[PDB]
Symmetry: C3
Subunit: 238 residues, 3 copies
């Protein structure tokens, strides 16, 4: 590590604040749910925001930062982003999976692709060459496309077998994931990590802040909005 | 790393020895169990002690040590403790979960809180500021309280629906966890990691040695004491 | 890190190429399988080769390398091997487990031993003393023997309760694992990591290349060879 933060810390704190607020919202919002199913959604969702909050606090306090050397240039890498995504992105897919009524093979595929995506993603963040970093960015992006392919394909088909409100709910959440998630690689390739520095680290941090907040608190908020629709994921009594 | 051990190694070896001995005890003690349930308890428990043993051996041989710089002072951090707890603590909760007859949402919550606890715990161990380290210690301690809240609440309620001997067994094990686990953060805050050095590293190592041994070998010994009571966790035939 | 590759890179590329080719083979080979079971085998298997491919590409580009100091000598460690095995070896056992018709306790034991094996294995790769490295090599090898003991024992017994073609298929795959897996520790102890340098890093890289390819692409190829036999792992309709 041994890297100082910078003016971007403003976004890091807003992010930390937002994630912490979403968590408390979901904790109180989840208060009183007895249905074992509705609860899953609250647990998964709540863990997504608190993890994100802790990592944002890590980058804010300067813990989740480091300096990576690449071609007579020292890039500033906020690695905590990966420790965050490594856990939160698969959970988000879990949410979608459970929402769509998908089976373990599909959900396992999604999780597997996702982890491969963040893993090759952090390799890219630390690679020692503009060529190597972009190669890895390329591997990781490929995986993103492979999992998005599962979302619009098999997963979408599963959701169509769900009650209409659930299917609708899925559609929204799926489309949110598609637009938001595709933006991450773009912000990365343009930002500091891509070695091209087209998008200043200050604005890159902000971009990731808006994305993370929308992909987690926003996502969670529309997911857990209605309790009755969410319990249509299952019909029988228990 | 690049840090030398010290006089505390005596405790590290005792610890290594104890954990290795508990393992062999459980391996031989588990010999002959056919009931698929009783076995779970033996597998989980046995993995707890061998993991602990390997990590204790790691700290003993000097592998699991490092030097962390914080405020013109170089703290000695035994990070292997975290690699240990990261795996053993969730397993211990698995044991309690299975013992109480808890459902996946409760057990998943416990595991999730626990991992968050050790994760923020090791961040704290490496933070670069007395203020940051204590902040993280604070986050981690909060999580400890959140999971303890689940133990005395929901988990205790589940156990009351179990056969009386199992409920009794739970009570003991739960109370053991509560008293022992609360002591870890105290030993940490007072020891070297807390930056206050109130409790010498030599005695801190001993304290953690007694705790780990009691929280694993002791715990295991009272858990796997009786085979008949343990099989009351399930009633039907198989 | 900060370590340069070397003439061994030739094997690393062949390896990268082979793993990538096996993956595409399995992806296309898995095209059209609807049976939820047959699919598991394809997903698990496919993830094994792509993980291996990415790690081989990591070592090829020099990312997965580092220099470890031990006794006035600086060893060259290809750590990516461990990040690879940490995920692929447990998956391979999953394949065998599912093939044998084993229960979760057996499969969990296998996975647990396996992870302990690679974990102590990478510790050994980084230990600071010929004596410590070999001690860990010793711990890890012990675990290898413990899991091999489960393969020829309980796992083999489970497979005998399977349809004959499945039992046969198991036998092959089990024997392949036994001969191939036992060779890893030998190649390690003789290679650079063992501190004895009996087997040059150049040939060590090749040896591991042949093993990895045989233990994954070979293994996969004989596993997924026949679709009908693989669906005999389950009989009823779904
Ligand atoms: C560190 C810290 C706080 C940590 C708290 C966290 C991460 C909160 C987790 C919340 C969850 C997942 C709750 C699930 C409930 C289930 C509760 C249960 C029944 C299992 O007790 C539910 C579904 C809403 O009802 C503060 C300082
Ligand atoms: C490295 C080394 C030793 C490693 C050994 C380990 C970590 C032991 C694990 C033991 C377990 C979890 C046993 C489970 C049995 C189940 C056995 C089975 C049926 C699955 O074969 C059971 C329940 C008691 O019966 C030595 C040097
Ligand atoms: C990064 C990159 C490529 C990444 C691709 C990977 C790792 C492939 C994974 C494939 C799997 C596990 C497929 C499972 C299918 C199931 C598909 C499903 C129904 C879930 O859509 C099945 C069983 C064959 O049919 C390229 C650049
Ligand atoms: C249906 C069923 C029973 C099973 C289905 C199959 C599953 C669940 C497969 C999962 C596969 C998975 C999660 C693969 C993950 C691969 C990720 C990596 C190899 C990551 C490597 C990261 C690094 C090497 C980071 C380096 C950092 C520094 C500072 C050097
Ligand atoms: C009921 C159901 C189907 C699912 C329920 C939900 C579950 C199981 C959620 C689990 C969540 C979980 C395990 C979160 C873990 C978070 C831990 C971290 C972010 C740890 C980070 C650690 C570091 C960053 C260490 C740094 C070390 C150095 C030397 C710099
Ligand atoms: C049947 C049922 C419900 C549960 C059964 C029990 C199970 C599944 C137990 C699993 C146990 C497990 C996976 C233990 C793993 C232990 C591995 C470690 C402690 C690894 C440590 C690695 C390091 C410390 C690497 C250091 C690297 C550097 C550069 C310093
Ligand atoms: C940087 C600040 C971040 C704050 C994050 C808190 C998110 C909670 C806001 O959710 C809103 O709660 C209302 C309850 O009255 C619902 O009616 C409405 O539909 C829902 O969208
Ligand atoms: C790392 C791998 C993690 C995989 C986690 C998968 C969660 C499995 C729970 O999903 C369930 O799967 C069944 C398959 O039969 C469906 O019928 C059911 O409707 C669906 O709710
Ligand atoms: C530093 C040394 C650590 C040694 C750890 C070994 C623990 C095994 C001792 O357990 C005891 O085994 C007896 C069997 O005769 C039981 O009757 C008794 O109830 C039980 O408590
Ligand atoms: C990282 C997440 C790990 C979660 C592991 C949870 C283990 C699930 C096994 O427990 C079982 O759950 C059922 C819920 O219906 C109960 O009815 C049953 O009595 C209980 O034995
Ligand atoms: C370095 C190059 C690595 C190439 C790896 C590709 C492996 C695919 C070869 O498998 C073979 O496919 C045939 C299909 O016609 C089967 O009939 C035959 O039984 C099977 O063994
Ligand atoms: C980290 C731990 C991972 C453990 C993964 C275990 C996968 C469990 C699926 O296996 C199933 O177990 C049943 C036990 O009752 C058998 O009856 C059934 O035939 C078998 O297919
Ligand atoms: C809460 C956080 C979320 C939903 C994060 C999502 C991140 C991604 C989809 C990231 C993708 C990336 C690539 C495809 C290429 C390389 C770099 C990454 C990691 C930015
Ligand atoms: C076998 C080991 C066990 C049961 C270890 C348990 C450890 C804890 C409950 C640790 C808790 C901590 C905090 C609450 C605050 C920060 C530091 C820790 C990790 C010591
Ligand atoms: C695809 C890769 C496979 C199947 C790799 C298997 C590796 C092993 C069985 C390794 C075993 C080792 C020991 C027993 C001792 C110490 C060092 C290792 C990691 C080489």
């Amino acid at each position: 590590m041994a890297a100082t933060v910078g003016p971007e810390s403003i976004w890091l704190w807003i992010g930390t604040i937002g994630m912490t607020l979403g968590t408390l919202y979901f904790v109180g919002r989840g208060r009183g749910v007895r249905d074992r199913k509705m609860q899953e959604f609250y647990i998964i969702t709540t863990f997504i925001t608190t993890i994100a909050a802790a990592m944002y606090f890590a980058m804010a306090t300067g813990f989740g930062v480091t300096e990576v050397v690449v071609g007579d240039e020292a890039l500033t890498i906020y690695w905590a982003r990966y420790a965050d995504w490594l856990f939160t992105t698969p959970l988000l897919l879990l949410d979608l999976g459970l929402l769509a009524g998908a089976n373990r093979n599909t959900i396992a595929t999604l999780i597997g692709l996702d982890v491969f995506m963040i893993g090759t993603g952090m390799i890219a963040a630390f690679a020692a060459t503009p060529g190597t970093r972009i190669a890895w960015w390329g591997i990781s992006t490929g995986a993103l496309l492979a999992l998005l392919y599962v979302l619009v394909g098999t997963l979408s088909k599963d959701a169509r077998g769900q009650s209409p409100e659930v299917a609708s709910l899925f559609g929204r959440l799926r489309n949110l994931v598609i637009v938001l998630w595709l933006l991450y690689p773009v912000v990365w390739i343009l930002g500091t990590e891509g070695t091209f520095g087209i998008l200043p680290l200050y604005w890159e941090t902000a971009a990731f802040m808006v994305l993370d907040l929308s992909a987690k608190v926003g996502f969670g908020v529309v997911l857990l909005r209605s309790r009755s629709v969410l319990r249509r994921v299952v019909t029988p009594t228990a």
